[PDB]
Design a protein around this ligand. Structure first.
Ligand SMILES: C[C@]12C[C@H](O)[C@H]3[C@@H](CCC4=CC(=O)CC[C@@]43C)[C@@H]1CC[C@@H]2C(=O)CO
Length: 121
């Protein structure tokens, strides 16, 4: 679920998901169109694609369980949807973490009309 993803992001990165990632670039949060701005946005693009791979799943509302093994995120057994959503969210949180070094506040609240360019999942 969205609140769980938010917590996973905070855990990984130290940033609150709202506002650091909820409106970032062309793909994070509501939004996704055009060319991603940066690596972090590309995380969102791939995450968007990841959710798109699951049209009869509801990742905002569906709660999954995960644990930590070494500080590593380990998705735990639920429904097939929950398992898959968990893996999507886990990847995105790790990707944010991997790309904190190029996170740019200038992409927060990024204007929709600057998102043109195209990209197939
Ligand atoms: C889902 C995200 C996690 C997080 O918890 C946010 C969400 C945006 C909307 C939202 C509404 C809430 O009241 C709870 C948090 C949450 C539902 C965030 C946008 C950034 C992050 C994403 O990157 C999605 O692209």
């Amino acid at each position: 679920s969205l609140l769980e993803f938010g917590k996973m992001i905070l855990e990984e990165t130290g940033k609150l998901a709202i506002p650091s990632y909820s409106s970032y670039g062309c793909y994070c949060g509501w939004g996704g169109k055009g060319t991603p701005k940066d690596a972090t946005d590309r995380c969102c693009f791939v995450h968007d694609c990841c959710y798109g791979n699951l049209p009869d799943c509801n990742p905002k509302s569906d709660r999954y369980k995960y644990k930590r093994v070494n500080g590593a995120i380990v998705c735990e057994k639920g429904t097939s949807c929950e398992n898959r959503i968990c893996e999507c969210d886990k990847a995105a949180a790790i990707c944010f973490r991997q790309n904190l070094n190029t996170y740019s506040k200038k992409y927060m609240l990024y204007p929709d009309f600057l998102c043109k360019g195209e990209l197939k999942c």
